[PDB]
Design a protein around this nucleic acid. Sequence first.
RNA 1: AGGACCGAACCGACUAAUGUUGAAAAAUUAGCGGAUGACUUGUGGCUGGGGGUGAAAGGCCAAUCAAACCGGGAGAUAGCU
RNA 2: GUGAAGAGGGAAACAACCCAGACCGCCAGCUAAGGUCCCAAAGUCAUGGUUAAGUGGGAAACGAUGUGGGAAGGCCCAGACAGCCAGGAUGUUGGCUUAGAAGCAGCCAUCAUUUAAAGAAAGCGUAAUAGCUCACUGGUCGAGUCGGCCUGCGCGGAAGAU
RNA 3: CACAGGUGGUCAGGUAGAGAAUACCAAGGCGCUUGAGAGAACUCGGGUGAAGGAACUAGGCAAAAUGGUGCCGUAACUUC
RNA 4: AAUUCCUUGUCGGGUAAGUUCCGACCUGCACGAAUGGCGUAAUGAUGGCCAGGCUGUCUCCACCCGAGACUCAGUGAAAUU
RNA 5: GCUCAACGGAUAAAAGGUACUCCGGGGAUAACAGGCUGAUACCGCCCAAGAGUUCAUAUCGACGGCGGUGUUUGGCACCUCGAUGUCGGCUCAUCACAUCCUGGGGCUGAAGUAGGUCCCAAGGGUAUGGCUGUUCGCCAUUUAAAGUGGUACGCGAGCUGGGUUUAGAACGUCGUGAGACAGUUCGGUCCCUAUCUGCCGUGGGCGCUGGAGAACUGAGGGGGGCUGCUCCUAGUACGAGAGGACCGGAGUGGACGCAUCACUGGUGUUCGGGUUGUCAUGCCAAUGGCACUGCCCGGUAGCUAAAUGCGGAAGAGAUAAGU
RNA 6: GACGACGUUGAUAGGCCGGGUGUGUAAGCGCAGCGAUGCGUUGAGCUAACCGGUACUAAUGAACCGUGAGGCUUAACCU
RNA 7: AAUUGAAGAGUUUGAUCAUGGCUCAGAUUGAACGCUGGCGGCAGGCCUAACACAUGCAAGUCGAACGGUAACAGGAAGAAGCUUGCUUCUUUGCUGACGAGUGGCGGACGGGUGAGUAAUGUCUGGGAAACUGCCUGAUGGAGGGGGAUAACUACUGGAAAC
RNA 8: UAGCUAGUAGGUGGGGUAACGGCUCACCUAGGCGACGAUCCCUAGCUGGUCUGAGAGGAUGACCAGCCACACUGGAACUGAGACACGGUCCAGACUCCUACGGGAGGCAGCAGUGGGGAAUAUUGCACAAUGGGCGCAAGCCUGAUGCAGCCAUGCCGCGUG
RNA 9: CCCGCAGAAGAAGCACCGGCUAACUCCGUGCCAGCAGCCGCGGUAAUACGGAGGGUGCAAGCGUUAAUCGGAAUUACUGGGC
RNA 10: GGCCGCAAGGUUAAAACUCAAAUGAAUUGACGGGGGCCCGCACAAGCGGUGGAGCAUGUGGUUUAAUUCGAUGCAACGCGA
RNA 11: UCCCGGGCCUUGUACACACCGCCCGUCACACCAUGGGAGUGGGUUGCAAAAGAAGUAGGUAGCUUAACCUUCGGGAGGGCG
RNA 12: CGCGGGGUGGAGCAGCCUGGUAGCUCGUCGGGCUCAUAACCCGAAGAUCGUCGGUUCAAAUCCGGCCCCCGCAACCA
RNA 13: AAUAUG
Length: 111
Amino acid sequence: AAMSGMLSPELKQQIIGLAEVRDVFKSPKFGAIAGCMVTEGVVKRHNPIRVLRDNVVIYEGELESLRRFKDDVNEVRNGMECGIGVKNYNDVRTGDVIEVFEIIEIQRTIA
RNA sequence: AGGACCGAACCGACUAAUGUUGAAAAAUUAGCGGAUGACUUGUGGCUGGGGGUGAAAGGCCAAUCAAACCGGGAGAUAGCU
RNA sequence: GUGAAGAGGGAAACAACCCAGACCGCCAGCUAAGGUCCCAAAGUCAUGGUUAAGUGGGAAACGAUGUGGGAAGGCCCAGACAGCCAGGAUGUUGGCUUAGAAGCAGCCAUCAUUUAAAGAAAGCGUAAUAGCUCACUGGUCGAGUCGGCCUGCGCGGAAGAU
RNA sequence: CACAGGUGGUCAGGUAGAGAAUACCAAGGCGCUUGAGAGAACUCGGGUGAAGGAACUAGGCAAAAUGGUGCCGUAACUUC
RNA sequence: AAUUCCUUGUCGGGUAAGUUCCGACCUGCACGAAUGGCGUAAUGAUGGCCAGGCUGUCUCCACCCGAGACUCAGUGAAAUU
RNA sequence: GCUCAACGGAUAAAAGGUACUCCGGGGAUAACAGGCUGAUACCGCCCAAGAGUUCAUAUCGACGGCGGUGUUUGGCACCUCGAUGUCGGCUCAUCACAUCCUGGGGCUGAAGUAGGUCCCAAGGGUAUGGCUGUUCGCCAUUUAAAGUGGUACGCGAGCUGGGUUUAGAACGUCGUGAGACAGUUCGGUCCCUAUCUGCCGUGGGCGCUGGAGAACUGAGGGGGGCUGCUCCUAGUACGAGAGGACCGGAGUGGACGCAUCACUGGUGUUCGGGUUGUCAUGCCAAUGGCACUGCCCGGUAGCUAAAUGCGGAAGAGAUAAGU
RNA sequence: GACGACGUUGAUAGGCCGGGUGUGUAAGCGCAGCGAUGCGUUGAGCUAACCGGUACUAAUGAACCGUGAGGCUUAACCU
RNA sequence: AAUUGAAGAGUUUGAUCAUGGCUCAGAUUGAACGCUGGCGGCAGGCCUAACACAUGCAAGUCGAACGGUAACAGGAAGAAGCUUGCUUCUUUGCUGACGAGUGGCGGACGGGUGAGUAAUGUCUGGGAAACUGCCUGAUGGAGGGGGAUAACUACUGGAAAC
RNA sequence: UAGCUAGUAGGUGGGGUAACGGCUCACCUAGGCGACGAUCCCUAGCUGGUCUGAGAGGAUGACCAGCCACACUGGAACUGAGACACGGUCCAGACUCCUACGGGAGGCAGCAGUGGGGAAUAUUGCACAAUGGGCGCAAGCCUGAUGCAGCCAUGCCGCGUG
RNA sequence: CCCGCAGAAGAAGCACCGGCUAACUCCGUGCCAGCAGCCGCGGUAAUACGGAGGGUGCAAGCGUUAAUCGGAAUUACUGGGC
RNA sequence: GGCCGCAAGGUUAAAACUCAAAUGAAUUGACGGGGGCCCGCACAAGCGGUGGAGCAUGUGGUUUAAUUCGAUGCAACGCGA
RNA sequence: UCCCGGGCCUUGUACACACCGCCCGUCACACCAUGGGAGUGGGUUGCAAAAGAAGUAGGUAGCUUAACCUUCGGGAGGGCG
RNA sequence: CGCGGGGUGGAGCAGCCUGGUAGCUCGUCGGGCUCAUAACCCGAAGAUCGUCGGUUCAAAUCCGGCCCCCGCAACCA
RNA sequence: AAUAUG
């Protein structure tokens, strides 16, 4: 039992939401704000994201600020206009899609 | 000695309940603050409306005030009900 | 086009839907839409069929020997289809990047003998032999049998709060 | 309004008490202009309470509790 | 932080358990030196947090004493329609 | 001779705040809520590559599809702006079943115990705290289980006013400023005596066919329907072992409901006693008034819980899913 | 309102008599002490609504409302 | 005849002399560890946990204080299996002794420990206000009576202790 | 650590101890101790000696012997000449054992020995033959005091390994 | 304690050797691996490491470590400075 | 930590740890943008050049299959050659 | 007199791998011990209260009691509480 | 359509209303100073003066367009 | 006032 607990396995990396960004905006703090439109799922704040262009991943990271208008809501559903920005991401281009995914741990047993 | 301390009258009105066509168009009950001071109160006077006064809230100026009341312009105007 | 500015009849109720434009009066008749078992005025009318779900009387993808009708086809008294009595093999335990494989998640072709017929292949599935059953085939029984197409009406899918 | 409100000054008894507090009384003035019964709900204003003692709640709100004189004693901190 | 959006930041103390609180870090969205900065004894019907005591605030409400309600007699409203 | 560009040109010549506000109107037009719709959401299903040591469908499920429910996030502005008080809590519920537990059953990659998933089932039950105004959520510790929803995101002519759209003030930020923020921070009046409908109770009138007093048959309607742990069977079945039953029977609890005061207690200002201050009955003694019953100590009945008795069932009939 | 008991051929209520329960050694008097105070008399006095008895007082004889043989038709019995 | 004995070196600087610290040669220990290891004598041997303990033993002894037979060692008496010289088994405290009990004296010595205690302590040097078993010296009493008790019997409370 | 002391300092009277005394009370007086270190804090048994040193000193207090204190922790009394009692009594605390669950029993800082500490220190031995105690007239009994042996090179000293 | 029996038979290790400090060369390693009390050795001739030969000290003991004094006239009264 | 002070600070006064020296003075030599004295195309006073121009030669650099190796401030660069 | 190189004497010095020397501190990196540090968690101990086993000492109505006194009925004294 | 100030060499300027070979700084590449480097000193490279039309003897400087940068603007998930 | 530094 002591051994089984020791294990730390998370077996799920399922996407929480997938969104495409369009019409980039400029921000002083993060350097960029990429306007987005969520096509599927729900976008969340602290959940990690995977930025990819043409099926290959241009950049990776975890969201710092999710803001729509001046509301700055922590959650955005699908087919609702949304806004996004992140630190350490220099180049925003249209046509790419950002994939957000939640992280969960399955847990482990000994045998 | 003291805009000192506790505490009646006196002045002030923080909390709670009652009252909410009430007894009262802001009070009663049980608590509470100051209470020799920037204190309080009588009587009379002065400051008059785009003006007054204001330890300043746009409060107060006769049960009212982001401009009193009364009369007149006046049957203002109202593309509105 | 109707209402708005049109009442009336029907659609249970329901301006705008259907039928139809109210001059007034009558205790007449024939009709429109819509109906004809009763509530509620008129067929429990007549004739040929469908459904058995209360479908009708809300709801799809999709599923199913529900049932009605129709045009063709495969197999079959040299014995079909479904039962029952049997056989179920040899190259071959098949070479094999193989610990072990002798059919199987693996390997590859998928060829080749004996035979009425039996696949280097169908499986619940072993420590490996297997134990067992099936495709295929013999005997028994003796007349229909198998499942695609077109189409009527039904079935499940079908769970909401007074 | 015959209104639980407001309204300046003067007079200041006995006992207990520091006291014009407060209680009980003297002098004096009052029982407040609807009463009678019933003794349920429930509300208003009060008293008491087993055990637990803030678990209530936005919040110790409200209640409860502390409550006087003399002596002893009295911390952090300080502009002493 | 009366200032901090993300946010209940992260760390430590308190609690069985603390989005508040107390003490730090500093990534100060958006403190900053008389539109004053940071301390500060005393003081406050001041804001937030904690302990003791204390108790019908509560678990969970019971009884009792008054004034209404209730009945009878007299007088006799109201908003509304 | 006019970018009178707002271009059929109101002046030659004009920008703002109002939460200190005010007037006239509007559901012609927003916010709360209803309604329509169902994209979105939630839920169920169709195809099944693949995962599952083999094996699609024990349990999951790519790539895509088709519905349901009216339930979140939205759309529209149809009801109400000569007024429908908005978040939550408290109190009080009621219904739906896509069932959290208990009851029944299939499959299981179901040994047993304990689970997974799906069907049938709404009778009953379905936690108290810490922090935050919060619902929610996180955390602590319980419980057989701490269901998911409707009901104007139930419920203010019932309560709360902490959140949040007033009037004070301040910080941060924005503007030159008045001020502003869907950014915080402190403080900040919750009216209404019930005609009708409804319900909880309790009466009067009349009828039921001559009138009257009793006892009933029971159409119909309501209440109740919860469950742990322990022991025996049995340390038996099962299982390598650890561990550990079904079926059936016997005890004792938690919550809830009804009754009751006999006990154990509370109350007990109508009973007795102690005692502070004062006045009075001439005074002493002994009593009485008043001061929250003056303050206290005990306590008769009655009422009542924390107190002690009992209940939920068994059995019968027809069935759901299943066999 | 109703509902239950009883109204003199009477225990309905109040009182009364006894008992219980409650409080817990009254008042008076005597004794001891200077006095407060104690002690004996004495578990005394007093005691609501409770328990068991008792007509002592009050529930008097009457009126009021309510009636006087109870429809028609048919069937089965009976003169 | 008897507390008759005194060592230095290395290192600061390019080198030198002072000042000055550090380091080493000596002896010693209630020692340990590392490696090795023949015998003997004497002495030493939980310095930390004053941390806690199994088991045996570490204080008993007097019959010459006293009532006593509970043990086995005799002697005595009796009854028997018999070998004619003995054993065997019940009586008797007659005795060598002695369980338990009353009494006397010792359990205040011996042994252990170094927790406390910076002075009711210790060491040293004085003092006066005391007692002191057993052991000694000195001068006299040891007269005469009474009422209890353990042990042991009769019961009874205990699981054991009592 | 510069101020510390109410029985505190002294007296009188009473009680108290075997004995002087604030030893312990009543009353009276305001003194007592302290810079020559009171009080408080930290550490520690002291001494003959041990070790070192030429000496003076320094460090040290095993074994041996004297004195003191302590006996699981805390507190108190009894018996007795002597104990405010190591293996005695009671009470309380912690701990362990026995139990019929009502209640009892136990204290290695004695000798051996074990757990545990730590770098590390011992045989659950033999004998009362001796020496010194206890009791007794004595025999004699008891004596983990003592005398001996075992163990380890721990130290000192002698000898061998030619 | 004494007598007899058999036979060199049964019995020597440890530190250290750069100076202090008695006692040296070679080989290997090459600021590597290690030594060390102090000052210091080793980066390709190491008497300083490791091994070997030789040697010195000491002996059932030998070293290291810890402990106290001495040296330390460096708490100095004896017996020092400013 | 105590005392003193309005403050700044004073006063009394450690330990852990770390280094193997620190310091004093003196000597020789070097150096000084220390002083004196003194010499040399060292400067001054002159004359003619280099650095530019074209070429030669040596070097570095670059490049290359090799551009052999060595010389590098004066004291290497028509150097060894 | 000035620049460069050199000699002699004298002077200063923290240079003696000899001024191309030596050498200070912030800051950045790593390690070590230590101070302050909201408080937490122990030891020991002062002061002011609570508590009162066992035992001893005092005071005792009650219960009980072989030795001694007696008028034989009980005392004196003891113990238990 | 909407304000400011500027365009010169690699970068930033001066030369402007005062119209005749465009000079002044940092960089660039050399040289000098030093034992050497930093620093400093002597020097050379380096241009349609934004781009055009106007205008003039010759316009860098003269006007207006095209155009660009900055300024505040005004935007600012 | 001419210069660090190595």
